[PDB]
């Protein structure tokens, strides 16, 4: 059967032929409660006390109990289980290349990494998730060290020189849709380039970047206060008023694409994709494949980062204290296996339940390449050139750039829009809203005794009235 | 897109790695999340707590 | 008076998110429930449901 399946596209032997042969069969949960499963065929070929002589079925591979997102974790059986859960959560937030035809699509939110790499340390289950063809992350030289104190409490130090070379650079694509609509006979929204002495209630912005069809052109730089779609609605000397589509605030970028079409009911429909390049920043979220999330705390240049005797600086420095309470030992084994993989010129195997891969075997393989067998290296201080007294664990580890950039979250309000009903500030950074000084904050300021600050927050920084 | 080779999908500006399994409703891709339910036509006997029933069979 | 969230907008941030959202199961027990038994990883989930992939928080 194995020999016939080795030539699947020659013999026309398939999985369905293997089912028809009486070799495999589908067992559901009710039937599984009556079967006797051998975990491996080693449970079958067992001596006088096999613990069971009446095995009815055998697992094809136990690592198939994982899902799509848990199958990208290297050495998942060397990690604490909540960390595998956290990586299963964060692998859906990792930016790579989400689909091949992303240039055709205008999704509302899109995220494309410049240089996604397949992991040096993969699982075999990843061969069917197409993670080799659409990867989300970069193999990074990670040194686990305390350097200048800027990686503490789940933070990373990044190499600024690496970042300048395109390390974890991404593209954010945002699509804006608008359409003319005939909401009544007299009402007629239309894509026109508006004129100041003709349109009612403009938002004091520039309109020169619009073409005379009312739509901005691809390749044009745009900023937060810029018009990209010029739509005017006829008012039943200001015969029409401004209902133009504006770019979202503080989201600078470049118009990548403009598409004009007809909707279902036959009106003009425009979709504009704006492209913005996201260079890695302090406060951007990065995660390894083991639940080791963390924001970038600082970025040092190559001459400031610690270096090995070969001149290798880490791309990312993570804190040692991220490891002990977490017990993400699979992170350390992935780093060691990735050092071995990058030296040997091969892709390391990190299928969960594999006795062919062992920490001692990886250590001996690493010592065969002129490195210390436990992955430590003598690092030198970047600032002074002196050897660090401790020897630093350093090697390639697969990291992921998560969707949570700080520039999509930074928000301040001095004064601005307020709600109609309660005359309090608005909701969210998208509406220039205020932050909620909630009930618990009120209790905390009661316990502080700061009554005038409590009055400022709850009366005259929110909604004074007489 | 049924039965099309990867070259035909690329000529239609579709990703051959795209799995399908979703709908396009007003241009938005919608996936139907599978929903768990109790199995039908099966007798299940439980013990309701703090109630007038010591045991209850349900089908 | 109808169940919500059966149809969801398909996640397209990563190919892994697309696959995970296309293979997603849902217990329609209210997330305000504070009993642990439907949220527990049952023994009978071996090989059927991933033991690691679950959301964090109310779900």
């Amino acid at each position: 059967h194995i020999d016939q399946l080795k030539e699947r596209e020659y013999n026309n032997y398939s999985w369905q032929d293997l089912v028809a042969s009486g070799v495999v069969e589908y067992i559901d949960t009710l039937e599984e409660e009556t079967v006797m499963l051998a975990m491996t065929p080693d449970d079958l070929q067992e001596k006088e006390v096999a613990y069971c002589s009446t095995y009815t079925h055998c697992e094809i591979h136990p690592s198939m109990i994982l899902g799509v997102c848990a199958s990208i974790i290297p050495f998942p059986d060397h990690n604490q289980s909540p960390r595998n859960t956290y990586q299963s959560a964060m692998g859906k937030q990792a930016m790579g290349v989400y689909i091949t035809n992303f240039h055709v699509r205008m999704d509302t939110l899109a995220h494309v990494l410049y240089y996604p790499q397949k992991p040096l340390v993969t699982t075999r289950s990843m061969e069917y998730l197409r993670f080799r063809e659409l990867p989300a992350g970069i193999n990074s030289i990670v040194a686990i060290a305390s350097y200048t104190g800027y990686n503490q409490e789940d933070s990373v130090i990044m190499n600024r020189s690496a970042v300048d070379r395109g390390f974890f650079r991404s593209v954010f694509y945002r699509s804006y849709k608008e359409q003319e609509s005939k909401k009544g006979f007299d009402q007629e929204e239309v894509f026109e380039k508006p004129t100041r002495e003709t349109c009612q209630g403009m938002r004091h912005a520039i309109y020169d970047k619009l073409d005379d069809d009312g739509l901005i052109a691809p390749g044009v730089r745009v900023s937060g206060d810029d018009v990209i779609i010029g739509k005017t609605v006829t008012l039943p000397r200001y015969t029409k008023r401004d209902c133009s589509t504006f770019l979202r605030t503080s989201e600078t970028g470049i118009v990548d694409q403009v598409m004009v079409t007809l909707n279902q009911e036959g009106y003009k429909f425009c979709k504009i994709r704006v492209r913005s390049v996201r260079i890695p920043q302090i406060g951007d979220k990065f995660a390894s494949r083991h639940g080791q999330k963390g924001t970038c705390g600082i970025q040092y240049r190559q001459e400031d980062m610690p270096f090995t005797c070969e001149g290798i600086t880490p791309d990312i420095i993570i804190n040692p204290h991220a490891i002990p309470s977490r017990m993400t030992i699979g992170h350390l084994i992935e780093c060691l296996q990735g050092k071995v993989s990058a030296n040997k010129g091969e892709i390391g195997d990190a299928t969960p339940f594999n006795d062919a891969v062992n920490v001692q075997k990886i250590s001996n393989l690493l010592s065969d390449y002129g490195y210390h067998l436990r992955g430590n290296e003598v690092l030198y201080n970047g600032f002074t050139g002196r050897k660090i007294t401790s020897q630093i664990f350093i090697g390639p580890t697969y990291y992921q750039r998560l969707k949570h950039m700080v520039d999509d979250k930074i928000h301040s309000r001095a004064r601005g829009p307020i709600q109609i009903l309660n005359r309090q500030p608005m909701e969210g950074r998208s509406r220039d809203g205020g932050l909620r000084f909630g009930e618990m904050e009120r209790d905390c300021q009661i316990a502080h005794g700061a009554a005038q600050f409590l009055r400022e927050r709850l009366f005259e920084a929110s909604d004074p009235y007489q | 897109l049924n039965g099309l080779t990867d070259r035909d999908l690329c000529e239609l500006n579709e990703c051959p790695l795209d799995p399908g399994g979703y709908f396009i409703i007003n241009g938005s891709e919608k996936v139907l999340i599978a929903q768990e339910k109790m199995a039908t036509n099966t007798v299940y006997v439980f013990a309701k707590k703090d109630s007038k029933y010591a045991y209850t069979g349900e089908c | 008076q109808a169940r919500a969230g059966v149809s969801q907008v398909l996640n397209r941030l990563t190919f892994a998110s697309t696959l995970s959202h296309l293979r997603r199961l849902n217990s329609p027990i209210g997330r305000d429930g504070k009993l642990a038994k439907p949220r527990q990883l049952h023994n009978t989930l071996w090989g059927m449901v991933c033991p690691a992939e679950t959301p964090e928080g109310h779900a």
Binding site: S14, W15, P41, M64 | P19 | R23
Partner: peptide
Amino acid sequence: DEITPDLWQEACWIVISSYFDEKGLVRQQ
């Protein structure tokens, strides 16, 4: 002939590759 334990890993990932060549990942939908 029986699959030897030294060939078992390669054989089991062959049959897993055959399963995912036929069914894929969204076969249930």
